[PDB]
């Protein structure tokens, strides 16, 4: 569905202050900590048992940076999300066999991370806008 111009402006303004080098790593670490079965796909990233080990893993931080770059790319093309995420969806579906629900889990974890870093600035309206954003990202990245 189309996103309203006010929601687009709020999303872009909130994403402008997002630390690209750290927010994605935070989201990926929180995903691997809260949902431990997501650590199955990152068995090559080293120690992933302790939550401190997951959050402090340099490979997890780098992959979170890449994930957040992909989110930024999908944000720049919010209206054409299937096209920009077609290759990533194919990669996750075939080479990695990542369940589509893991994308929604990572989206919700990212929403929680954004709320955590932005405090009261993450108002219910901008949260709804980002929920639409992450739902679109997960749908475009699935099947």
């Amino acid at each position: 569905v189309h996103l309203t111009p006010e929601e687009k402006s709020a999303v872009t303004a909130l994403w402008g202050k997002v630390n690209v080098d750290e927010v994605g790593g935070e989201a990926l670490g929180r995903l691997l900590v809260v949902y431990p079965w997501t650590q199955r796909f990152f068995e090559s990233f080293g120690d992933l048992s302790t939550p401190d080990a997951v959050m402090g893993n340099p490979k997890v931080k780098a992959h979170g940076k890449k994930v957040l770059g992909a989110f930024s790319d999908g944000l720049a093309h919010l209206d054409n999300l299937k096209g920009t995420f077609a290759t990533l969806s194919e990669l996750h579906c075939d080479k990695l066999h990542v369940d589509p629900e893991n994308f929604r889990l990572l989206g919700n974890v990212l929403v929680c991370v954004l709320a955590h870093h932005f405090g009261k600035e993450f108002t219910p309206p901008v949260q709804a806008a980002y929920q639409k954003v992450v739902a679109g990202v997960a749908n475009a990245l699935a099947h």
Partner: protein, 440 residues
Amino acid sequence: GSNLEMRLTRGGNMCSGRIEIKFQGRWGTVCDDNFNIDHASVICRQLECGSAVSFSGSSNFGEGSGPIWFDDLICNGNESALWNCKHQGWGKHNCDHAEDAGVICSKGADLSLRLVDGVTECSGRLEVRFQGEWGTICDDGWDSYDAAVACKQLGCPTAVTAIGRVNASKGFGHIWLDSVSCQGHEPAIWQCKHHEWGKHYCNHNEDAGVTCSDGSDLELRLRGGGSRCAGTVEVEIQRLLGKVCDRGWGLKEADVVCRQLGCGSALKTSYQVYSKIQATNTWLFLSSCNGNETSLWDCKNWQWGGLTCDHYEEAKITCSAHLRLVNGGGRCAGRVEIYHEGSWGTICDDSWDLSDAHVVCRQLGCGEAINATGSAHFGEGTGPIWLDEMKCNGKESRIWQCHSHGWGQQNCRHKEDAGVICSEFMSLRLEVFYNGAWGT
């Protein structure tokens, strides 16, 4: 043994067809289980037929007949022969003859590219030929690099490459290519990374196109706004009319359009209608670009046609080239207003003499004072009284540093807000009123 002759049967030529290996004096086929591009590349290098174009496992080449030698193979790509991977046993399988795997190699491939249903020979709905069959391309992942690669492969002026089929309708048949990923240096379109041939998750509505041009036939202007630099964005590409859709269209591309027309920056995405304009089937969709570019064609990945701007609206643009004294009747006279606690406040005229007037006039730089008016001479102020009894000696440069009763400590009302008339205050009525005296 090391004497296993391998042949391809019923696939047009020697390099394309269903795999068939001769072992133990009998010819046997190969299963399609866990069959990917690595196994196809191994097969192609076995026959010295080059790279692996694709693979087929649905027995499209034809039903086989014989002992299927291989069922499951774990090939990383670099093998001296097909009989080197983890073939999980020889002859053992769980297939039937309907699961036999084919392969199409580069040397025997008849791959070709063409453009159909376009304004010129360098634009339209791109199509590719696979297994002698012409099919279209889905537009997912189809970026400007893919457009440039296709333009170079076809061969015609490719200075400006634009995605999006020009006025082209949906194709027919198969979608042989999808999610093309080119870095812009591949000699052809099939050397790029993409999905398996035939396998896709699109429909014919999303048929990818291309617009190869040298940049001399791309024109843009604003129509319907009367002036040259206000109105909807009309697009002329290869003598074809068009209008810009507002999907992914902010102010950043609007100022790019304005700069291209040469009318400063962009003000708003709206205009006052002057005349009616026609509606064109094709549209210009702008994904995103930085906004500092000197022209609209010069920023990355702008789609020209190929989609319907029905859910969205036409893109409009209108370029840039389409302490204090209050209520005193002057500058150095009026109610003495002080600021405190984020609110403007007044000073009660209790024991307000000419010393306080001198202090407040010199603090404001208005020289000395002529009068110390009371009883709200310049109107009653609207703000809590801060100072009540001013005991300034007439020499200090600030009013708040005097012997007052403290901020908020008062027993007065706003009906007696203190006011002063400094010497520098001037009034005109010919008579001029300076230094508290009227004169010619």
